[PDB]
Amino acid sequence: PNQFVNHLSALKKHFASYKELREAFNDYHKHNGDELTTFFLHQFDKVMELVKQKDFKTAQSRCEEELAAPYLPKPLVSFFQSLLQLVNHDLLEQQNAALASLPAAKIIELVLQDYPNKLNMIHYLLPKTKAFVKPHLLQRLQFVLTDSELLELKRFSFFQALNQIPGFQGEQVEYFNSKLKQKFTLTLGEFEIAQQPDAKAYFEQLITQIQQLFLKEPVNAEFANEIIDAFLVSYFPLHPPVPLAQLAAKIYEYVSQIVLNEAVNLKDELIKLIVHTLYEQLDRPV
């Protein structure tokens, strides 16, 4: 299933092919060969086996679950995310062969067609070479990030993909969040999750709190973590107009109860929680 807040850190290193990544990782093992790094390197290879058999769809599912395991070490998170990118690239190419021989500009055209739809195709440019996408092309995508009618999940995702395109490293972009009713100027390629200082500290604290309230219940921590994702996505640049502790409590109350017990829709906290939770958190995967 994976997650968003699983790395409130700096931009992960870029890998254009499987070999470079297979190397970078094996080396990490020859200098950190403990049990975990051994197991995960082992899981990493399972995926590559599927990649070789062109069973990309499955390769994508196994890769997204390794990333979901809360036991995965911080440094090994960027390795898998890089794998997922290569995989999704191969998946898109096989579903849209036309993509195999097209320059970035033409690829962007296909990504914009049935407008909201097809935005996922933008993921085909991530594993490209750092010189494959000139910086001027960014201006053609701008309108997507400022569309007042676009679902926050689609816009955030679209933004998180651009954020990873080498060619746009350092560029600034306008981003409009419809929930906060205001646009922002953000820099691409600097951070994994580039939220403003306050919003970053707010979510950092919110994650630690639900983690502490669900210390006995690891399954419940996962459900609460999903809710935290929905809020991070829906208010992305910043954070919801909610007193931190109050959010943590209702998130706790909400999942604690759902394991059989009727939550109270009268409470504004549960209401907004439900309006966001996933009702606005669904979108077709790559």
Burial 218-256 (b: 16+ CB within 10 A, else e): eebbebbbbbbbbbbbbbbbbbbebeeeebbebbbbbbb
Residue 173: which H helix or E strand, with range? strand 172-177
Last residue of a domain, one of 145, 177, 194: 194
Instruction: Quote the number of domains for the chain.
Output: 3
- 203 CB-near residues (< 8 Å, 6+ apart): 5, 8, 195, 228, 231, 232, 239
In degrees, rounded to 5, the angle at the alpha carbon of residue 60 between the alpha carbons of residues 58 and 66 is 105
Range of the domain at 249: 195-286
The residue with tokens 């092309």 is: 137
Q: What is the separation of C-alpha 156 from the centre of its chain, rounded to a whole number of angstroms?
A: 9
β-strand partners of 233:
none
67 in the same domain as 126: no
**Exposure of 34 in the CB half-sphere (CA atoms within 13 A):** 6
Q: Are the CB atoms for 176 and 183 separated by under 8 Å? A: yes
Q: Output DSSP code: residue 13.
A: P
**Which experimental method was this entry solved with?**
X-ray
The residue with tokens 């080396």 is: 27
In degrees, rounded to 5, the angle at the alpha carbon of residue 61 between the alpha carbons of residues 92 and 45 is 95
Residue 223's domain is classified under what CATH number? 1.10.472.40
182 in the same domain as 199: no
Q: Are the CB atoms for 50 and 58 separated by under 8 Å? A: yes
- 255 CB-near residues (< 8 Å, 6+ apart): 220, 223, 224, 227
Write the CA distances from 19 to 60, 62, 143, 191, 194, integer angstroms. Answer: 18, 19, 36, 25, 29
Q: Output DSSP code: residue 14.
A: P
Residue 50, SS3? helix
What tokens appear for 36 in the block? Answer: 């975990």
Radius of gyration from C-alpha coordinates of the chain: 19
| CB burial of residue 178 (10 Å; 0-12, 13-18, 19+) | middle
Question: Hey, what amino acid is at 254?
Answer: Y
108 in the same domain as 59: no
Which alpha helices (H) appear in 9-73, and where do they start and end?
18-29, 36-52, 56-66
169 in the same domain as 218: no
Residue 116's domain is classified under what CATH number? 3.30.1790.10
Total length of the chain: 286
- 251 CB-near residues (< 8 Å, 6+ apart): 210, 224, 227, 228, 273
| CB burial of residue 22 (10 Å; 0-12, 13-18, 19+) | middle
78 in the same domain as 4: yes
Write the CA distances from 121 to 65, 82, 84, 125, 238, integer angstroms. Answer: 21, 17, 14, 8, 27
Last residue of a domain, one of 194, 217, 251: 194
Write the CA distances from 273 to 30, 122, 266, 279, integer angstroms. Answer: 45, 30, 12, 9
